[PDB]
Amino acid sequence: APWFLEYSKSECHFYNGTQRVRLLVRYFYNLEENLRFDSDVGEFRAVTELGRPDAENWNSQPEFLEQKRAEVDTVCRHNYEIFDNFLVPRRVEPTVTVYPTKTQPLEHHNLLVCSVSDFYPGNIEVRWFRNGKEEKTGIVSTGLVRNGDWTFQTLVMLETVPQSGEVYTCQVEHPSLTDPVTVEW
Amino acid sequence: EEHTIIQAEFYLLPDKRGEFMFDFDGDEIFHVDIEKSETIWRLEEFAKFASFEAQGALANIAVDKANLDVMKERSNNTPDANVAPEVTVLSRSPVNLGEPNILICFIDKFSPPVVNVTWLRNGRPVTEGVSETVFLPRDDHLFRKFHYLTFLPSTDDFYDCEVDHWGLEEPLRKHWEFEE
Amino acid sequence: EEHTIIQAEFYLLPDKRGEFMFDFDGDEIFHVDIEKSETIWRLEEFAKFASFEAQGALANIAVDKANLDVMKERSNNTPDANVAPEVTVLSRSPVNLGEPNILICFIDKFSPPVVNVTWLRNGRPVTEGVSETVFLPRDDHLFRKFHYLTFLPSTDDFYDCEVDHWGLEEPLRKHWEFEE
């Protein structure tokens, strides 16, 4: 079945606040990106043949090209200042829970799971400790799962053969936490 | 500070569907209901901190409507293949029997941006207690999309996420069951 | 102070023509060249005191393109009659033999906004040394439009302004000759 798609992404990239801003407009037609507009370039740049006409036509409109370059201020900067009020500063504490599993054969247990869910933003640290010593190998992660509803979740597992007398402790550090959370097992 | 603000829009055909939306660090801030000509915040809370005039976006789409006609002739036999989606289903939060939870059906890397998703409980079509996001953008030229379903954890029930796409031979079907 | 600032735009069919322009106290400040996607000042001088982003206007027209399709079905057999234009021809400034002057062909109160005007010198089609304004708005729902022709005053030559419109049975033809 034949489908035809005109799509456009207008990316605003922010480095250290509004300090460094950079627009990035990218046009596609179906699966092919055929044109783009780099703020630090100043004008349209075809990316494929099908994107030439527009670059030539749109580039010959100094009034228009005046506007685009403006957008880094008009839109990017503009909107950043608005979002800066609740988006940039948004924080949701993660719910930390631990528990064992088999994952393989069985009898005893060899997979210790630290489940960290419902948190924001995405940057976070989850460390595993055996009797006070950090486990740097034998870690398995599910990665940073984005739920699309502005909250993440993840699992950080430790491969281990539990020796009675040993206390395992998951450590979780996150911007929404004053002090790193811990959970022992 | 390291942040990204993406404004994505598009128009499709034959489907005759358009979209306009804003993304902040990989999450939807809101989109515009073409039909209803209104702004839809991805989270209620967002409305009290901002505002947007939807006719603006509608304009842009009209733009894109026309642009696409141009693009179709400009290419001459440009259409071709599409990208089937990868689907993954999993619980939103730790699953505890009896405690209401949410199943997330995550549709990734595909285009055109149009799908037919269906939630299946014990092989049955669930249409109540479900939600979905518009098509979200990726680092590339493909889209991503979330589907949700509220449910009551049980050891005896099973769930399926059925996704249909042009790039699919036959409907795709991702399964999911509770495990203690 | 008593002033008026009018912004007029429209899209026509079948003709498939659109317009966008600004008026200040009955005079054109400028309009937007749909085709060339550029701003045309009615007087050179105006550019140095202002600026306008033409893609904006183009947007609006796209809007109006769509709107018209809606309006056509919404009415169902709405079309009907039109308004023939009143034409008047006269000199721009006192006429003195030998001294270059300008003939103005003033087309008034008509719609749809589309005409076929032709300058005639001794029955001959003049296409050099002529100019015209877009369609201007009136206090009502009809349009006005100017046509110009540069000429060399002579006691033996005669001029005609030939206007054609849908509301006309046959081409209209206004005459003009010098008189001392």
């Binding site: 006409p53 527009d54 957008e71 | 829009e9 947007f52 304009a59 842009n60 026309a66 642009n67 | -």
Partner: peptide, 13 residues
């Protein structure tokens, strides 16, 4: 709660 500005698309002739 100021307005969220967008990007005026363009017409592809």
């Amino acid at each position: 709660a100021d307005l969220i500005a967008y990007f005026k698309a363009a017409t592809k002739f």
